[PDB]
Design a protein around this nucleic acid. Sequence first.
DNA 1: GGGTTTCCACTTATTCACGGTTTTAG
DNA 2: CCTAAAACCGTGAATAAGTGGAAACC
Length: 289
Amino acid sequence: SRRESINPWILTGFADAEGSFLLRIRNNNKSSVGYSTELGFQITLHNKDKSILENIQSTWKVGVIANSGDNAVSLKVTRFEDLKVIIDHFEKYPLITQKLGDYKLFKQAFSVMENKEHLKENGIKELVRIKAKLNWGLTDELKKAFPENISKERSLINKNIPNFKWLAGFTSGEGSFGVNLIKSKSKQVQLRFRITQHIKDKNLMNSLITYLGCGYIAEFSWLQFVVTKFSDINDKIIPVFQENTLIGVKLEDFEDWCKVAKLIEEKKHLTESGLDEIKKIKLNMNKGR
DNA sequence: GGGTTTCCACTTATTCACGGTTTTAG
DNA sequence: CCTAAAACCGTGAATAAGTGGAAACC
Ligand SMILES: [Ca+2]
Ligand SMILES: [Ca+2]
């Protein structure tokens, strides 16, 4: 094992995909103020893509990888001084989804802990206000212990895709390359490239159609950006990710996706031998892989 | 060393990735 | 008539986040 460096925009794009921040406020009787804290950033992936965590850790030289279950692997960046490396990276390469607001409050808690103010109750009360507008909110225990209020209202992030490398990192995490075999008589193979995201990023999802110049948005939360015209796929969708290399097992799925795209380009998908060969490539990829 | 950090094990709520069909476009 | 691109489904699980516990640090 040697690991490889990852494009920082592909990394920042992947952080927008599967990344997550954490801010812990735990009841600690041994603590002086009665509550200890832990701040950092984490990513949880499947064991099949554990190489990404090693390559992400090799690029930053921070964080630790530990098994997050029988079928999961996680990377946690909890060291305080090491968080400065993750912070300085995101300042130069900012987030574009609804996670940028979480990083803004991630810095707002690092600064409280930077001045060592997280040991006094007056400073701890500030950390309780930060946790409200971030994350999933405070638990019932933390809400009962602190009746004080916080006012900020996390505003919806309005940003645009900076470059293709961000899209490559985001699509590597939240993108799906599917080969659709529609059933019909006589003797249909369809290629679709869907991307699922929450309704909170509908501003980004709507801009994704104009950014690539194609696609339609389907419609509970949820959302979906789908492209089906083979002219757009073979000319605007497939060559974009070929220039900006992907990361993870989805690259091998993309590699097997281009093979079926070349057959449709040669129009050999109508042949029985071509359709049979597509079934072999389709079954040995995506969920079957 | 006495609070304080940082690390490992392990869990939980839901947005995912992903599949398959029925129906319209042209 | 024909193959294409669009529209509708539907769910399991890999996620996005979370806690308990104790070691390790200074
Ligand atoms: Ca996400
Ligand atoms: Ca994924």
